[PDB]
Amino acid sequence: MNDILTDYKTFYLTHSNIVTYESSIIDSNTFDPILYPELKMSNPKYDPVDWHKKTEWKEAGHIGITTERPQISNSIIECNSGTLIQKPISLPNFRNLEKINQVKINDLYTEEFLKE
Amino acid sequence: MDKYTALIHDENFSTLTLNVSRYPKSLAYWEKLLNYIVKASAPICKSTEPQLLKLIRCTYSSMLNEFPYLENYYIDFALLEYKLGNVSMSHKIFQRGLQAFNQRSLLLWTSYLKFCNNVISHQKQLFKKYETAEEYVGLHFFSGEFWDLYLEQISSRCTSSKKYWNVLRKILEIPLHSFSKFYALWLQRIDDIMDLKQLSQLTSKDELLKKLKIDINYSGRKGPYLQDAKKKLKKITKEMYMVVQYQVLEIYSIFESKIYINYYTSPETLVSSDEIETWIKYLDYTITLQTDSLTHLNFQRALLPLAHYDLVWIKYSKWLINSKNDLLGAKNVLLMGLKFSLKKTEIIKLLYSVICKLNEYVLLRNLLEKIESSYSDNVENVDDFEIFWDYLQFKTFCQNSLYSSRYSDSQSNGLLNKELFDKVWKRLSCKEKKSGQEILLNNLVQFYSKDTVEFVEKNIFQKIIEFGWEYYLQNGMFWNCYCRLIYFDTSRSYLDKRQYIVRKIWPQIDKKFAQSVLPSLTEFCESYFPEEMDTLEEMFTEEP
Amino acid sequence: QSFDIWKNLDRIRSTKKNAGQFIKGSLLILPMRTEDKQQFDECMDELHKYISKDILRCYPQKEQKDEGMLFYIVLKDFNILDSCFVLSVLLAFQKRLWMAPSEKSYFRVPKNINLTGSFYLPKNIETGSSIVEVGFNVVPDFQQFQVKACHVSKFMNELSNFFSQVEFGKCEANVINYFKREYNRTYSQISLALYELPLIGDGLFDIKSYISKTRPIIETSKAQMIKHISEMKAYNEIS
Amino acid sequence: NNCSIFVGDLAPNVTESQLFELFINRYASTSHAKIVHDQVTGMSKGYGFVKFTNSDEQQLALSEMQGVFLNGRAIKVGPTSGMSQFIYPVQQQPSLNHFTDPNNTTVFIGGLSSLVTEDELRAYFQPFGTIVYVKIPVGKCCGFVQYVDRLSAEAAIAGMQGFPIANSRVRLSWGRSAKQTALLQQAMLSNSLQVQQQQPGLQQPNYGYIPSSTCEANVSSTMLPGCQILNYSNPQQVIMQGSEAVVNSTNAMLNRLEQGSNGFMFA
Amino acid sequence: MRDIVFVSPQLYLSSQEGWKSDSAKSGFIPILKNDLQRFQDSLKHIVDARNS
Amino acid sequence: KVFVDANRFDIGDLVKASKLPQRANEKSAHHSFKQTSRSRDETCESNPFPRLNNPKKLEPPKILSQWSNTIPKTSIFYSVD
């Protein structure tokens, strides 16, 4: 896939013009044949375009092992104190405070290779 | 004579100045020269010569324009200008220092605010400056000194005793390194309460009535009522302390206990393979949190030690492209990456695609003009082929952009332009000094027409046959590309081009030069000419 | 709707609920680049015949590169309609030179072109979609704003929805020359950085001391790598 | 335990050998002993630290040496270590499995269709980083991909997850090597200990190497930090990173496209 | 300022105009006026490799 | 030049002025350790590689001792020594 994308970046920049290029740009999947073969080099899957329950928030700091870390729902770390002084801030809403010691591991190596 | 005239006629000053101006990116020479100039003025005051003070200011300005990532030297020259009487020039030095890191350097904000605690003579302007530092750099991991200073200034200046509670309540949700001091201040300030009516300093009364089921105006015996208030607020603070403690403990025990260097040493330094890897891991963690100020802060923190390694520049550019769809930001990232990185290949190659997505092609032509003028129109004799080839792709794109097509079937002219073919032929004539010879030979055969293939085979290949150069006649990949040029024609039949390749190419090549051609031609013959294998075998056999 | 500028101008004059009042203390700067000057001059003369001198001003470069010119278009105390008109004309013209060299109409925008551009505004803004802000801007004082991949009517509606929410005020007097000096300084720095590109090897890094400073260190690191490979081979060996 | 005792007010003619003889081999076993001398003069300041393995032997030595004759003066061998709010955090260990090892850089791949080869499975995991072996078990529809870097393993798991190889979805996790798997199978057949071993490190610091960097191919290297200095070879040895690396990689990928268009290799 | 000259090798080794000046321009290194020939004679091999 | 607190520009003369000149001989003969006075003239040539010259591991984030019983007892990665 890297060889195909590098050969397409070699061939397309030497056999095309801006008139063909600007008509090929669509906004449904942000497809641009100059820059899209560069971003697709690292990962095989790539999408062009509820975060706390996905498979990326859970294994962020460490890969392979999943965990549900505790966070604060009404986090005020982004709002400046010039806006937080306008009104008194409500109580902090809590979640995942019952899994501060519990971690689970999708052990495939023991179950599929050792114990068959 | 004064110290300035003795400083001019001294023998060591000229040698140090020539060693600085001989290699400008050797920071130890700059520091030795700066220490010698400061040693030349052993009393530093306002009664010294201004003709030497202007030279000190020019030396510091040249050092800070050559090395803008030095954190301590902006502080040094700013407090030098504060020692020399004025503060407007010191404020200008602080502003250009904070602009050198683009408002995301903790040490310069800390030193500028310790400076501004005495020199501002205005309270609302101090609050606007500290809130600017809060919204830009206030999410730093090691920012305990900044927030301790800001809480000290609130506790010293404010008399309403309300903003301190607000800022400390904000700090009790921020993952700081030195965080338990703020929790200890919070717990001893809950102990320092005097009545129930101060609970409105924490939250509103409806949030106390709904979440904690407690009223402010509940009159009666308020002893155990306030004790139950303290216990429930201590339980909520303990839960939020467990959350922030797990976050800080995770960030420390996985990431922050590995990075040992957090400062800009020099453009000549070397950073270990552990620390680069842990910066990449920490920024991969930082992207997931999706807090934008903290993410840009940690990317600037990773640009602090190792901006010359070009990995975090390209990573932060790709993050601004795909995760935010903010591509002018990535354009400015790649523009500032040209000023620091030494391996300028991949940053300029990505910046080409960034400019081409923006549909600003006059900017692309003005950028390529700087490359073709940086060599004084001698891009064909460059040692690094990765610069010239990334230039040549987009220059061919620009030549297809300006000029119209020459051939049929809507085929625009590629590398065979009058401003492009000469640059290729100037590089192909070296034959041993310039690498990337077969890359052009595999990329000049990608037209596949009737007259254009004849044009390519007439300009270079027939000319190589006519001159008979040793390097291309020895290499079999040259003849492999030449056979691939004819065999993939779209106008000829199979029998005529097969008779062409068999009869009028293979007897033309040399028999004693076939020792390096036969491993490259045997693969092509096994590929496309199966019945022509034993014919080529009887031509290159061991006996005459 | 249509592909004409004036019909969308009539539409944006009609249903934007008394949008004739301009913005107090309003400023916009559009730096653009053209390959040639003679094609630009006719469109700019038509623009000065349409837009007055007090609202819009133009600033040339110093001709240092001699190939790529840089022209500032400063819109000062502008209304919301003239801004949309000027940005539509300039965003059509700086891309028509690459897409349509044979159309030959400075006020008719075709359908195959998408408007994508970048314009600066002062920092003192208050917003309290296709136009986005930027992160990590290169200008110390000004904020860069991006529009991407729009038709004519979408460009009109998005620029009007952007300028109906933002609130300008209290701009500095000769801030144009300040932006000129800062822009020239920044791009002269990156041009000098591109001039430093052939000067990497043996030029200005003090290689004579840098070889001797790292000569035992790379050797010990290579010995550590060889020991790592041998220990990995002993670790993966069953034996 | 490593209990530390601080001897003080020693004489000038008392080196580290006399303190080690007076501390160790007297009803105890002192692991280390160091007298804190001057930074530039070389003379001892009269203080020294003695770290032993057991706390009871160090306590008995501190109780027996309290007032003993040490080179004409007192020993003062009282302990140095062992109501504030601030205490350092202490943690236990995850007992060293193959998940909680930060030096564990080999990825266990499973869910294969028993159809992919070894060179093709090398070609799946080649640009993520340098690699050492791609051998797979036969009949077990699984394999092992060991890198050198841990960030390369992170990139491989973050990219290759959910990627179907030969109409069969992949399962990526962690795992040990083949010899450690054989040791775990030999210790699990009798079920005595079933203990694992940590993967060895890199003997850090390492200035020359840049992580997630591949190179397939005289050398006049300037050793500049912006470029790459050293790299691991592709099988294996250590190579000096030359300037003609992207050229050789481009020639290699053009040769790979030419030999893959015909069918001389499937990878 | 007398007995000074501002110069940078980034504009001299690239062979551009304005590579030397007498006034305080941001980004230039101040050297002595009588040692400018010693500066030009020091970077001879880089200019010779640039021309050849 | 900044953190040494003796080569500071604005308040370094205050440090160099009142040394508390120790007119008692016992106040000068009591301390027998090194001064480790870092001069301003220290350049980048000294200590080129900060990892070869043995640094210190940074201190952990300190936690409250009254709320120390709620720490996660199981770490994420295996740390040795």
B318 vs A73: CA distance, rounded Å: 29
The beta strands (E) that lie in chain F are given as 63-64
Nearest-CA residue of chain D relative to C217? D207
| β-strand pairing of D142-147 with D131-133 | antiparallel
Q: CB–CB of C152/C95 below 8 Å?
A: no
Domain definitions of chain E by residue range: 2-43
The CB-side HSE value for A3 (13 A sphere, CA atoms) comes to 17
Tell me the helix, strand and coil percentages in chain F, rounded to 5: 20, 0, 75
- Spatial separation of the C-alpha atoms in residues B382 and B376, rounded to whole Å: 11
Report d(CA B115, CA B539) in Å as an integer: 87
Q: Which residues pair with A104 in a beta bridge?
A: A66
Instruction: Answer yes or no: are the C-beta atoms of D109 and D172 closer than 8 Å.
Output: yes
Q: How far is F68 from chain A (nearest CA, A)?
A: 14
Decide if C218 contacts D240 (C-beta within 8 A).
Answer: no
Q: CB burial class (10 A; 0-12, 13-18, 19+) of residue B455?
A: middle
Q: Are B25 and B308 in contact (CB under 8 A)?
A: no
Instruction: Tell me the DSSP string of chain C.
Output: --SBHHHHHHHHHHSSSSTT---TT-EEEEEE--S-SHHHHHHHHHHHHHS-TTTEEEE----SSSSS--EEEEEES--HHHHHHHHHHHHHHHHHHHH-SS---TTB--SS--EEEEEEE-S-------EEE-SS-S-SS-EEEEEEEE-HHHHHHHHHHHHTT-------TTHHHHHHHHHHHHHHHHHHHHHTSTTTTTTSS-HHHHHHHSHHHHHHHHHHHHHHHHHHHHHH---
Distance CA B363, CA C70 (A): 10
d(CA D35, CA A16): 76
* F56 HSE (CA, 13 A, CB side): 3
Distance separating alpha carbons of residues B78 and C98, to the nearest angstrom: 49
- What are the residues of chain A with a beta carbon less than 8 Å away from any beta carbon of chain D? 2-3, 6-7, 41-45, 63-65, 105-109, 112-114
Residue B253 gets which letter from DSSP?
A: I
The two beta strands, E20-21 and F63-64, are unpaired
Inter-axis angle of helices B494-504 and B476-487, nearest 10: 160
Partner-chain residue, chosen from C185, C189, C204, that has the shortest CB–CB distance to E9? C204
> Which residues does residue D6 pair with via DSSP β-bridges, in sequence order?
D49
Q: What is the DSSP letter of B251?
A: I
Helix count (H) and strand count (E) of chain F?
2, 1
Mutate to test the interface with C, among E10, E11, E15 (most CBs of C within 10 A): E10
Task: Return the HEC string of C18-77.
Answer: CCCCCCCCCEEEEEECCCCCHHHHHHHHHHHHHCCCCCEEEECCCCCCCCCCCEEEEEEC
Three-state SS sequence of A60-88: CCCCCEECCCCEECCCCCCCCHHHHCCCC
Distance, in Å, from the CA atom of D266 to the CA atom of D264, rounded to the nearest integer, reads 7
Q: Distance of alpha carbon B203 from its chain centroid, rounded? A: 43
Please give, rounded to a whole number of angstroms, the shortest distance from the CA of E28 to a CA of chain C.
12
**Angstrom distance (rounded) from CA D264 to CA C165:** 63
Phi and psi for D36 in degrees, rounded to 5? Answer: -80, 105
- How distant, in Å, are the alpha carbons of B87, B126, E24, F12 from that of B83? 9, 22, 22, 11
What are E6's strand-pairing partners? E21, E30
Residues pairing with C73 in the sheet: C30, C58
d(CA C88, CA C109): 9
Taking one residue from B and the other from C, the number of pairs with CB-CB distance under 8 angstroms is 104
3-class secondary-structure state, position A100: coil
**D69 contacts: CB under 8 Å, gap ≥ 6:** D75
| Residues in chain F, overall count | 81
Dist. CA C131–CA B325, nearest whole Å: 11
Residue D166: phi and psi, rounded to 5, are 55, 55
DSSP class of residue A26 equals B
Check if the beta carbon of residue B21 is closer than 8 Å to that of residue E7.
yes
Of F32, F60, F73, nearest to D88 by CB-CB distance is F60
* H or E stretch at D30: strand D30-37
Which of B24, B328, B342 is the closest to C134 by Cβ? Answer: B328
Instruction: Of B54, B120, B61, give the one whose Cα is nearest residue B84.
Output: B54
In D8-160, where does DSSP find H-type helix?
A: 16-23, 55-64, 118-124, 150-160
Instruction: Report how many Cβ contacts below 8 Å link chain B to chain D.
Output: 85
Which residues have CB under 8 Å from A7's CB, separation 6+? D253, D257
Least CA distance to A61: which residue of chain B? B285
In 3D, which of B280, A31, C231 has the Cα closest to residue D149? Answer: B280
As a whole number of angstroms, the distance between CA D265 and CA D259 comes to 7
| Bond prior to D205 in cis (omega within 30° of 0) | yes
d(CA A92, CA C96): 55
Residue B541: what residue type? T
Q: Which of residues 358-397 of B touch C (CB under 8 A)?
A: 358-363, 365-366, 369-371, 374-375, 382-383, 387
Write out the two tokens for D252.
Answer: 């290699």
Cα angle for residues B118, B121, B126 (degrees, 5° grid): 80
The arrangement of strands across the sheet holding E20-21 comes to E20-21, E5-7, E29-31
Phi and psi at D232, nearest 5°, equal -85, 135
Of B83, B177, B178, the CB nearest to F9: B83
- Answer whether B417's CB lies under 8 Å from B399's CB: yes
Beta carbons of F76 and B250 less than 8 angstroms apart: yes
Instruction: Compute the CA torsion angle B178, B184, B185, B189 (nearest 10 deg).
Output: 160
Interface with A, mutate which of C35, C96, C99 (most A CBs under 10 A): C99
By CB atoms closer than 10 A (0-12, 13-18, 19+), residue D250 is buried
- As a residue count, chain B comes to 544
Residues sharing a CB contact under 8 Å with residue C221, sequence separation 6 or more, in sequence order: D206, D207, D208, D209, D230
Please name the chains neighbouring E, where neighbouring means 3+ C-beta pairs under 8 angstroms: B, C
Closest-CA residue to E42 (of B374, C198, B17, C200) = B17
* Calpha distance D177→B375 (Å, rounded): 52
- The residue to which tokens 């001057």 are assigned: D38
Q: Are B24 and E8 in contact (CB under 8 A)?
A: yes
Strands C131-133 and C115-121: unpaired
| DSSP per residue, D152-179 | HHHHHHHHHTT--SSSS--EEEE---HH
Of A61, A62, A101, the CB nearest to F73: A101
Considering Cα of A52, then A54, then A60, then A65, what sign does the dihedral take? positive
Q: And the tokens for C135?
A: 């992160």
**For residue B415, with 0-12 CB atoms within 10 Å meaning exposed, 13-18 middle and 19 or more buried, which class applies?**
buried
Kind of pairing, strands D86-87 and A65-66?
A: unpaired
Check residue C17 and give left, alpha or beta (phi > 0: left; psi -120 to 50: alpha).
left
**D110 phi and psi angles, rounded to 5 deg:** -145, 180
DSSP string, B55-121: HHHHHHHHHHHH-TT-HHHHHHHHHHHHHTT-SHHHHHHHHHHHHHTTS--HHHHHHHHHHHHHH--
Rounded-to-integer distance, Cα B446 and Cα B423, Å: 18
| CA angle (C34 as vertex; C31, C37 as ends), nearest 5 | 115
